[PDB]
Symmetry: D3
Amino acid sequence: ENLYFQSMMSEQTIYYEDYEQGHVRLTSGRTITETDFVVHAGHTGDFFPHHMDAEFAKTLPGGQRIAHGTMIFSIGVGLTASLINPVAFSYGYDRLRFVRPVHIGDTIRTRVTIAAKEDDPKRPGAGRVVERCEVINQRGEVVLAADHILIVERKPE
Amino acid sequence: EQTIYYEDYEQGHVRLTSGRTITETDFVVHAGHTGDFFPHHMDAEFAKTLPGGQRIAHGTMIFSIGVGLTASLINPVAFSYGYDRLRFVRPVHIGDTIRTRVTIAAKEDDPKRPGAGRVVERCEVINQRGEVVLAADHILIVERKPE
Amino acid sequence: EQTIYYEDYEQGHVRLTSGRTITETDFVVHAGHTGDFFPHHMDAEFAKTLPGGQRIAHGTMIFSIGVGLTASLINPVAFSYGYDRLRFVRPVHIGDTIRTRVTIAAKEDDPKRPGAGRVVERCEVINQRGEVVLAADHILIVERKPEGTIQ
Amino acid sequence: QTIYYEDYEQGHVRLTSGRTITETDFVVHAGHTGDFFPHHMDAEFAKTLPGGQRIAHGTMIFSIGVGLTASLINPVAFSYGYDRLRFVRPVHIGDTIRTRVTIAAKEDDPKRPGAGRVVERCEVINQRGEVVLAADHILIVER
Amino acid sequence: NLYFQSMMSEQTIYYEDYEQGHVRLTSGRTITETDFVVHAGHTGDFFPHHMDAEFAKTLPGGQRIAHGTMIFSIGVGLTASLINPVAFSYGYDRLRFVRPVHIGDTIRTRVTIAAKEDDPKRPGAGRVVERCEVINQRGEVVLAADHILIVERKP
Amino acid sequence: EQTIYYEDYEQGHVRLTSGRTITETDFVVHAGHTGDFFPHHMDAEFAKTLPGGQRIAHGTMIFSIGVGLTASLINPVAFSYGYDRLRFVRPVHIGDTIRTRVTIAAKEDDPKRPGAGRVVERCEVINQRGEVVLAADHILIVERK
């Protein structure tokens, strides 16, 4: 283990064998603000009026501006970035789904569940772990879901 | 706004966006926006330990900006259902420049909706070496032309 | 990148951008970006004592966002020379929504630049009531299509 | 600019103009610092707090509070530190703050005879005139 | 009061006190890559001349150039002052983009009270033109504009 | 989230945060957030004339970021009363990387709160050379178990 992580409270090294199927964690919450809409637009270059024009949004089903899909994804994932596992590599995501729209003033939390574990066909010293991520709003409704695929080092001899 | 119905999507149609250089500011803004300050992205000293020896962009940043580059016109009769097979193919470093290729990759009927079809838009983000750094299949549910 | 040569600009052509609501965020970002935190812009209590009773939008913010709304139309053969008659016309309140109307107001030969022409694009920033809040004449130096050799 | 040590006058008070603390400022402060604690960032959680709404980060009230005094920054004063920084009252979205700076003390230093200690008492006040933050700024000033 | 000073939130300056020929030069501010990225984010303008370093190699100076609205906004911002209750800011004339600004250039703004004129429709006010010139670290003018004020005459 | 009561704090316990490189972006964002654009921080040409020859970070930025690095796990049972002895020890420059060392420095009975105690957490912001650049004593009022 790199000396960096010595004395780091937020570091939890979990090797492939020690991931527990069914383990669940839930993040703290974050209210999605009009600032977040404007920051996301400026960061990504997406200024579509569905996100940025309160007058146009009155004509939409639902009558209000809706958050960019990539914002709910980025923030939902970002909420999980508290504990670092230095032995896990982020390979990608499967089945990213936009389940419900998110509006200004909604508050989100992310639930992360260890879903599946398999051998890595390419690397014998690693395994694959799927973390199911569910972003939930203040009504307890899923607004986004995705399966995060991690390539996790096996524990050393 | 340009209404494009299911039947008008052309399998194999491709567009490539303009380029955007990914800067250290983008790393710092992404961390600030998302809450992800992991040292692989934010600590230049720690990042010397990575195979590239330098900080790597968040996967969600390359996704968000990659997709953002394609946000040039809206189709009011296409619903963004989700993405399949999002892959972080190669790291992106400060100073790399990305462009996004969007391809109409597949079209299928929708089992539940006879009034709509599914269109898969393949999104491939490429760097200044012409290498794919991120790929994902965008799933759209697109209404059929009336009558 | 869509190229339009001088001769293809159509006198009197009008285009209108998509809209964008001017938010309190935009005020705070503009103040932070430009260094202008004076209380007529940034102090809601003091602003109660001003004509109108509300924080006053930075003129440069309405200009920068107003022009920014037009950015999708990229003309690589046009050089931005400057602007004439930048006018601050009406208040813009937090929550107002703006669009920019761009009209080809004038085309003229430029004697200093034989391979180019001058195009004036009148830009009018309009609010949700259709009122002009800011106007400016954008001066473009636009390349002519290559001089042909006429046989 | 400049104010030499002898030019400071104990008891002098300066009151800044105001700045309204916005939701933007909360979100920017979290992004800038990495502090996303739910007291600041989660309006549902914040309903459980005594005020029932989100409260500004102490470091934001400090940074913006001190920033209001910037047009008055003396280039001949080394900023040594602060004593007795206190988070007196919460600041909510939409509150407006001003900073009151009082020259609280001047003392000769046993380490530099060619300089003196100046203490500037800083009080951030809200639109109700209530102190929300206080701190003693220690300056080492050229004699 | 020597012992209690309240910073103003406004400051009245009548026509006669804009003294023609008066010059002021602001402090400097280095224009950074952050400023380019923030400006694009703020305005929605991501044009490759400003945002694509590879594309910019093909341009005459070989590098990204600042948005005109950025140099204007920051240049004016450097000069920002207290609201003047007796002056109306009409807008600007003859805004010119004189030279490109690159990442790492440092700018200051020079404001000269350039011309004063009577107003035929307003005997109790007069027109004041403030010539604003944004200069870079070499002292070259990169942007110029004439700020137009209508200012009440002293009672 | 982790609840730690007064008795649970261990005199002398030490932790170090993750690190963060202080970038030019952080300087620009700090100025934009605080309204302080003074040339020592924001003018690279002027800064050549200063003793170090380069722009120096705002004290309030090193404090805000240095403390922010510690904000990874809420203790709901602790109240943030203030800080003593905030000291600006060394300048921080663009490209310096900081992390924060947090030490439980002192524990004592709260004079007026029977059901709480007082904990001092010394925060030392440390650069890439391991040098302390900023120190502050975070004063916590912590509920008894």
